[PDB]
Structures are given as structure tokens and as C-alpha cells.
Amino acid sequence: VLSPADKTNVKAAWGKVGAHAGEYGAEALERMFLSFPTTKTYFPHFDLSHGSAQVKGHGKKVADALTNAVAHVDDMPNALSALSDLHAHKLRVDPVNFKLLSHCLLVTLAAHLPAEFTPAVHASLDKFLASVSTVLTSKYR
Amino acid sequence: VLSPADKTNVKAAWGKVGAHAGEYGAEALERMFLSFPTTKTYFPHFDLSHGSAQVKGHGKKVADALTNAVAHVDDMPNALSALSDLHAHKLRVDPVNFKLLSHCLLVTLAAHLPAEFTPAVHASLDKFLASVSTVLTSKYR
Amino acid sequence: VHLTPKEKSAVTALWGKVNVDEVGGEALGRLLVVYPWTQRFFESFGDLSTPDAVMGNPKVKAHGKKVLGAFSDGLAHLDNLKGTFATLSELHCDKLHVDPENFRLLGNVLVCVLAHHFGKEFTPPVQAAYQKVVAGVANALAHKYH
Amino acid sequence: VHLTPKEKSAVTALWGKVNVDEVGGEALGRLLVVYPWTQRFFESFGDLSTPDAVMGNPKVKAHGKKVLGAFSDGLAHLDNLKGTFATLSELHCDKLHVDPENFRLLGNVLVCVLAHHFGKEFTPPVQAAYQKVVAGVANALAHKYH
Ligand code: HEM
Ligand code: HEM
Ligand code: HEM
Ligand code: HEM
């Protein structure tokens, strides 16, 4: 469960991302594809090379979904229900892969927001991304 | 999320356990200790040998907690809140270990209830134990 | 992986009783039912819409027989699992890109199927020996990731 | 594990800039804060009640320096990580019984600490090279379980 301090920390850290939201999402995806090449197979219709407009556009979608989760942090199963259906049913994304993308999002935030990425905020962000991941893997049937 | 069919399947399978509830819980613990010896370190005040009265008594506690979860399957975070505090805060049980005990509970049920352990019911029981595990690991702070 | 002689005995004795035409398909079918994301790798197998459809699918039974054959092969080479699974490692890791966590899952599903078939005969010490085996197989199949 | 020459270059170049007195403690401290069950193994370290308490704890900083030393040692022996970590494997697996998933977690926390310290210099390809390294180290430390 996310504590009051966790929600405060996540809101503050994500608040600093700003107009870079889409950019950081794209960077996290690139980090994931390079570090964990098994994840690439979900995107055969994507060119995954650096500077790919498709990865850039998809990073904005990922960031917008995370922003929605932050904005509705007390109601995340409902807020992310459509995305949960998509990832579990249609796409059949292996649950392990959410841990991989979550780690790459943490790395991306650490690389860009050194003042925000304190040990406490690192912990809050990890719990938040794990909570998001729990919702997105909740619909395997 | 547990579907209506999942809840029906779990209730039916667990209904067949009966007066063997405590016994099967003790057997699952023994299976876990022998198969995954890292888990033994949580119980230094226990004699973990076969026929141990302490493992027998603890198996009944595990079974009673699972029975409580079945009986309150739509309200499991609340029903298991005290047990979540215990396992995460006080005992600091590694989240990996819940996957190990859940697997050993499935093996125990498979070994005792061949008619009940259909592929569909196996799936429902796995989702149920994963849900229980999610609640019991929800309180790391 | 190192099994004691008692464990080796327990493992080999039970395996001789295994129905090699059916147990692999039951394990692969249950993997597909219990962990539905694994169906992503078996689109060409046809009807996987229900558990009954999966378990009765002739391609699932046929492919399961090959999987079980590989486990049998590993049981005969417990001291060289890496060499035994080299080609399958290249297939599952380099060609298919299956996350290795799923190797662990299929092994544990196999252990459930053995428990289902053998009942009280699948004692806790027999299980513990089989857990060593399926862990060894998973690690060997994952070698190309290491 | 096999790094390309470009990856080896990227890894060694960054590691030379690492503050070896601090980075290990930051990684171990963050492990204890982010994954609080790991505190179970460090009861003798005293005050771990708050993140500040953990990060400022002299025993955490001291033990972190030894951990980082072991990573440094692994970086010098990428082609023989098993031998390099044999004694530590026996300690962490046979004596301590730490679940090997936590070896993976500490490696990923280290990668986060490197990203924190180096910023844009910790590029996606540099990260990918470090992920190979920390995976190799975790697998080697886990050998006694295999
Ligand atoms: C923090 C976790 C994640 C978030 C917030 C997220 C968010 C999203 C969003 C917003 C979309 C677009 C939905 C739409 O356009 O209808 C999407 C699509 C998709 N996601 Fe994710 N996702 C996450 C994790 C993952 C992971 C781990 C994988 C696989 C490794 C994955 C694979 C995909 C794929 C393949 C698509 C479809 C792309 C396409 O066909 O254009 N997602 N995701
Ligand atoms: C299905 C998952 C689990 C259930 C339902 C469960 C249930 C319980 C219950 C009912 C108790 C007794 C509570 C009390 O007396 O106040 C307990 C205690 C305990 N549990 Fe679990 N547990 C689970 C998983 C685990 C795992 C995976 C571990 C470690 C590997 C673990 C380690 C312990 C320990 C060490 C105690 C305290 C024993 C003592 O000091 O007497 N539990 N659990
Ligand atoms: C211990 C674990 C496993 C063993 C022993 C195993 C064994 C095998 C064997 C013997 C084959 C046939 C290779 C051939 O025709 O020469 C095969 C093929 C295949 N496996 Fe597995 N497997 C395992 C895990 C998995 C998992 C977990 C997945 C996916 C979730 C998977 C996906 C596939 C696919 C898609 C093929 C067909 C490849 C092709 O025909 O080109 N395997 N495996
Ligand atoms: C890549 C992962 C790891 C590395 C490289 C590593 C390295 C080390 C080193 C160098 C030592 C000092 C050994 C000595 O004094 O000779 C040590 C001790 C220790 N480690 Fe780790 N470690 C890792 C993961 C872990 C984890 C995840 C835990 C627990 C969550 C852990 C628990 C301990 C404990 C309790 C000791 C003290 C043992 C003693 O003094 O008797 N280690 N480790």
C-alpha cells in the first residue's frame, strides 16, 4: 500500500518531470530495449533504433498513463482498467517485463532528477511503479 | 482479480479439504522446508523434522488463515490486515518466499485431491494464492 | 546439480512410472492455462480459448511429448545439463526470447502434474529431489542469457 | 558474461570515476530502505529506523565499501566470475541463506546509484553494459544454489 508520504513523494518527483514527461518515457523504453533485449519482441512494427519517432511517441503514451496514475493514485485499478485489459489480454505481456520497465524508469529519473531521487523518494517511486505494475498484470484470464 | 468462476472453484476445492485443513498446511510447510532450504531460517525456534508438533500446529494456523481468506474473498486486504503487518513488518519475510509456499500448497492439494485439481481449478487456486501473497506482502515500509 | 543417491533413486524410480505420452502435454497445457501470457508463443497451435480446448488440443499434447523428452534427457545427464540443453538454450533464448522465469514456471507445473498423478507417492523428499532437477534444467536452458 | 570491447570500454571508463568510499554504502543503504525485508540480515548494524538513519549509519557505509570492492574484483575478472565469487557464494548461500533474488536487486540498486551520480553520462548503452555485469555477478554469487 502507498502511504501518505509515498503519495506526496511521487507527486513531487513526478511534478519535476514536466514537459520532459514524454521524453523520459521514451528514454526508459530505450533503456529497457537495450538492457533487456527479450522485451523487444513486443514491438516488431516499431523501429527501436535511437531517435525513432515511434519510440518517442510511445514514450509519451507511457508517461501519460503514469501521470494518470499519479493523478488518480487512490483509484488506480479503475483509472488503469482499460490499460490492464490491453496489456494482459490482447498483448499478453509477461509480468516479469513490468519489473524491467519499472527499473528502467527509476534509472531514467535518477539520471535526470538528482535532487529529487533521495533514498526515501526512490523507495516511494519503487512502490508506486510496483503498484502500477500490479494493476497492469491483474487481468490475465 | 478473481473472477466469479475463480471464487466458485476455490470455495469448492477448499471445501473438500475439510478436517484435513491443518494437516495439509503442515505438509505444505514441510514440502517448502525440504525443497527450498532458505525458508528454514525463519523458524529457528521450530524443530522442522518430520512429525514435529510445532510444524503441525503452525500448519493449522496457515490453513485457518487461508480459510479466513476464502470466507472473505471479496474483502481480503481487510481480513488479512493483521497477518500482513506481521509478515512484512515484524518477520520481514522476503516476498519470494510466498511464491515458494504457494507452489508447495498447490503441490499438496494436487497430491491429495486428484478429482478437484483440474486445470481450471489449478488456475483459480494459483490466482487465489497469488492474491493472498499480494496482501501479505503489502505492508513493507 | 547434485542429487544424493537417495534422491537419485527416488527420482529415477518415479520417472520410470511416468506416462511419457501424456504427462508432458498435461504440463504444457497447464502452463498455457495457468499462465496465459505463455500462449503468446503458441499462436500456431489453434484453439486455446478454454481450458478444455487447450488440454484436448492435439498440438499441445504433441509438443508436450517433446518437452518431456528433454526432461528425460536431462535426468540422464544430471552432471552435464549445460551441454545437454545447449541447442535448446539457443532456441529458447536467442531465437524465441522466452523470459527464463517461464522455464522455472514450467518446471513447477511439471512438479504439480507429478504430484497429481502420483499422489501420496510424491512425498515431500521426492518433491525436494525433483525441485533440484527442474531448477537445474531451467538454469541450463537459461545459459545463453548468462 | 561477454561484453563487447565498446561495452568494456564504457564500463571501465565510468568505474574509474566512481567514488569507492561512498557508492557501495549508498547502494547498500538504498537496498535496506527500498527493500526493507533485507534489514533482516543486518540486525547488528544498529539504527535502521529511518532512511536518514540508514544512510548515515557508519556500519552501512563500511560494509558497502566491501560490497563495492567485490564488484570491482568482478569487473577485473569478467571471464571468470564463478571462481571470483566462490567464497562469497558459500557465505551468502550456504551460511547466510540469502535468497538469490536479492543479489539481482542489489545489482539493480547499484545501477540506480550509478545513474544518480553520473546523470546523462550514464547513457542507455552504458547501462546495458552494466546490466550484463551485475547479472553476471548475481549469477556467480548464486552458484552454490545451482
Ligand atoms: C509502467 C508500465 C507500463 C505502462 C504505464 C504502459 C503504458 C502503455 C500505454 C499508455 C500504451 C498505449 C495504449 C493505447 O494506445 O491504447 C501501451 C501499449 C503497449 N505496451 Fe505498455 N505500458 C507499460 C508496460 C509495458 C511492458 C513492460 C511492455 C512489454 C515489455 C509493454 C508492451 C506494450 C505494447 C506491445 C503496446 C502496444 C504498442 C502498439 O501496438 O502500438 N507495456 N502501454
Ligand atoms: C499463504 C501464505 C502464508 C500464510 C497464510 C501465513 C499464515 C501465517 C499465520 C496464520 C501465522 C501465525 C500468526 C500468529 O500466530 O499471530 C504465521 C506466522 C509466521 N509465518 Fe506465515 N504465512 C504465510 C507465508 C509465510 C512465508 C512464505 C513465510 C516464510 C518463509 C512465513 C513465515 C512465518 C513466520 C516465521 C511466522 C512466525 C512463527 C512463530 O514465530 O511462531 N509465512 N503465518
Ligand atoms: C524446462 C523448460 C522447457 C523445455 C525443457 C522445453 C523444451 C522444448 C523442446 C524439446 C522443443 C522442441 C525443439 C525442437 O523441435 O527441436 C521446444 C520448442 C519450443 N518451445 Fe520449449 N521448452 C521449455 C520451456 C518453454 C517455454 C516456457 C516456452 C514459452 C512460454 C517455450 C516455447 C517454445 C516454442 C514456441 C517452441 C517451438 C519452437 C519451434 O518449433 O521453432 N518453451 N521446447
Ligand atoms: C551482488 C550482491 C552482493 C555482493 C557482491 C556482496 C558482497 C559481500 C561482501 C564482500 C561481504 C563481506 C565478506 C567478508 O567479510 O569477507 C558480504 C557480507 C555480507 N553480506 Fe553481502 N553481498 C551481496 C548481496 C547481499 C545481500 C543481497 C544480502 C542480504 C540482503 C547480503 C548479506 C550479507 C551479510 C549479512 C554479510 C555479513 C556476513 C558476515 O560478516 O558474516 N549480501 N557481502
Experimental method, per PDB record: X-ray
Of ligand 4's listed atoms, the one at least distance from the Cα of D96 is 35
Do residues A107 and A55 make contact, with C-beta atoms less than 8 angstroms apart? no
Resolution in A: 1.5
Question: Any idea which residue has 499478453 for its cell?
Answer: A92
Question: Any idea which residue has 506526496 for its cell?
Answer: A8
With CB atoms and an 8 Å threshold, state whether D97 touches B38.
yes
Q: Calculate the dihedral angle through the C-alpha atoms of B40, B43, B49, B54, rounding to the nearest 10 degrees.
A: -150
Q: Which residue of chain C has the CA closest to A93?
A: C37
CA of B17 relative to ligand 1 center, distance in Å = 41
Residues in chain D closer than 8 A to B38 (CB atoms): 97-99
With CB atoms and an 8 Å threshold, state whether C36 touches A92.
yes
Interface list for D 7-66 with A (CB within 8 A): 29-30, 33-34, 51, 54-55
Residue B103 is labelled as binding a ligand = no
CB-CB neighbours of B44 under 10 Å: 7
CB-CB neighbours of C84 under 10 Å: 21
Identity at D43, one-letter amino acid code: E
- Environment class of D44 (CB within 10 Å of its CB; exposed 0-12, middle 13-18, buried 19+): exposed
CATH number of D1-146: 1.10.490.10
Domain range list for chain A: 1-141
Q: Which of C92, C96, C101, C144 to mutate to test the pocket of ligand 3 (most atoms within 8 A of CB)?
A: C92
Taking the C-alpha atoms of residue D69 and residue D132, their distance in angstroms, rounded to an integer, is 18
CA of C67 relative to ligand 3 center, distance in Å = 7
Interface list for C 78-97 with B (CB within 8 A): none
Q: What is the DSSP letter of D21?
A: T
Q: Any chain D CB within 8 A of the CB of B16?
A: no
- Ligand 2 pocket list (CB less than 6 A): B 39, 42-43, 61-62, 65-66, 83, 86-87, 91, 93, 97-98, 101, 132, 136
D78 to D6, D7, D124: CA distances (angstroms): 14, 12, 21
Contacts of D35 (CB under 8 A, 6+ apart): B140, D102, D105
Taking the C-alpha atoms of residue B86 and residue B100, their distance in angstroms, rounded to an integer, is 18
Do residues B66 and B133 make contact, with C-beta atoms less than 8 angstroms apart? no
> Distance (Å) from the C-alpha of residue D31 to the closest C-alpha of chain A?
9
Do residues A97 and A39 make contact, with C-beta atoms less than 8 angstroms apart? yes
Q: Which residue of chain A has the CA closest to B3?
A: A141
With CB atoms and an 8 Å threshold, state whether D97 touches B37.
yes
Helix runs in C35-142, H state only: 51-56, 58-75, 81-84, 86-89, 101-118, 124-141
Do residues B94 and D100 make contact, with C-beta atoms less than 8 angstroms apart? no
All chains having 3 or more CB pairs closer than 8 angstroms to chain D: A, B, C
With CB atoms and an 8 Å threshold, state whether A3 touches B138.
no
Contacts of B70 (CB under 8 A, 6+ apart): B10, B11, B14, B128
Taking the C-alpha atoms of residue C42 and residue C96, their distance in angstroms, rounded to an integer, is 11
Q: Could you tell me the three cell numbers for D48?
A: 535502521
Q: HSE on the CB side for D61, CA within 13 Å?
A: 9
Residues in chain D closer than 8 A to C136 (CB atoms): 146
Whether ligand 1 lies within 6 angstroms of the CB of A48 is answered as no
CA proximity to D14, closest of B120, B60, A111 = A111
Contacts of C146 (CB under 8 A, 6+ apart): D1, D135, D136, D139
Q: HSE on the CB side for C22, CA within 13 Å?
A: 8
Q: Any chain C CB within 8 A of the CB of B96?
A: no
D119 to A32, A133, D15, D79: CA distances (angstroms): 17, 26, 14, 29
Do residues D124 and A30 make contact, with C-beta atoms less than 8 angstroms apart? yes
With CB atoms and an 8 Å threshold, state whether C124 touches B34.
yes
Take atom 42 of ligand 4 and give the residue whose Cα is closest.
D92
Do residues A11 and A70 make contact, with C-beta atoms less than 8 angstroms apart? yes
Take atom 43 of ligand 3 and give the residue whose Cα is closest.
C67
Q: Could you tell me the three cell numbers for D37?
A: 525485508
CB-CB neighbours of C98 under 10 Å: 21
A140 to A88, B118, C34, D54, D129: CA distances (angstroms): 5, 18, 9, 39, 33
Do residues A98 and A134 make contact, with C-beta atoms less than 8 angstroms apart? no
Of ligand 2's listed atoms, the one at least distance from the Cα of B42 is 35
Identify how many contiguous H helices and E strands chain A contains and give both numbers: 7, 0
DSSP code string of B92-119: ---HHHHHHHHHHHHHHHHHH-TTT--H
Do residues A135 and A76 make contact, with C-beta atoms less than 8 angstroms apart? yes
Q: Calculate the dihedral angle through the C-alpha atoms of B101, B106, B108, B113, rounding to the nearest 10 degrees.
A: 160
Query: Coil, strand or helix: which one is D2?
Result: coil
Of ligand 1's listed atoms, the one at least distance from the Cα of A39 is 30
Could you give the angle at the alpha carbon of C15 between the alpha carbons of C14 and C18, nearest 5°?
A: 100
Q: Any chain C CB within 8 A of the CB of D136?
A: yes
Residue D117 phi/psi, 5-degree rounding, is -75, -35
With CB atoms and an 8 Å threshold, state whether C40 touches A92.
yes
Residues in chain C closer than 8 A to D135 (CB atoms): 146
Q: First CA to last CA across chain B, in angstroms?
A: 24
Do residues A53 and A30 make contact, with C-beta atoms less than 8 angstroms apart? no
CA proximity to D111, closest of D89, D95, D127, D123 = D127
Taking the C-alpha atoms of residue C132 and residue A56, their distance in angstroms, rounded to an integer, is 45
Do residues D63 and D28 make contact, with C-beta atoms less than 8 angstroms apart? yes
Domain A1-141 has CATH 1.10.490.10: yes
Contacts of D79 (CB under 8 A, 6+ apart): none
Residue B87 is labelled as binding a ligand = yes
Taking the C-alpha atoms of residue D140 and residue D103, their distance in angstroms, rounded to an integer, is 10
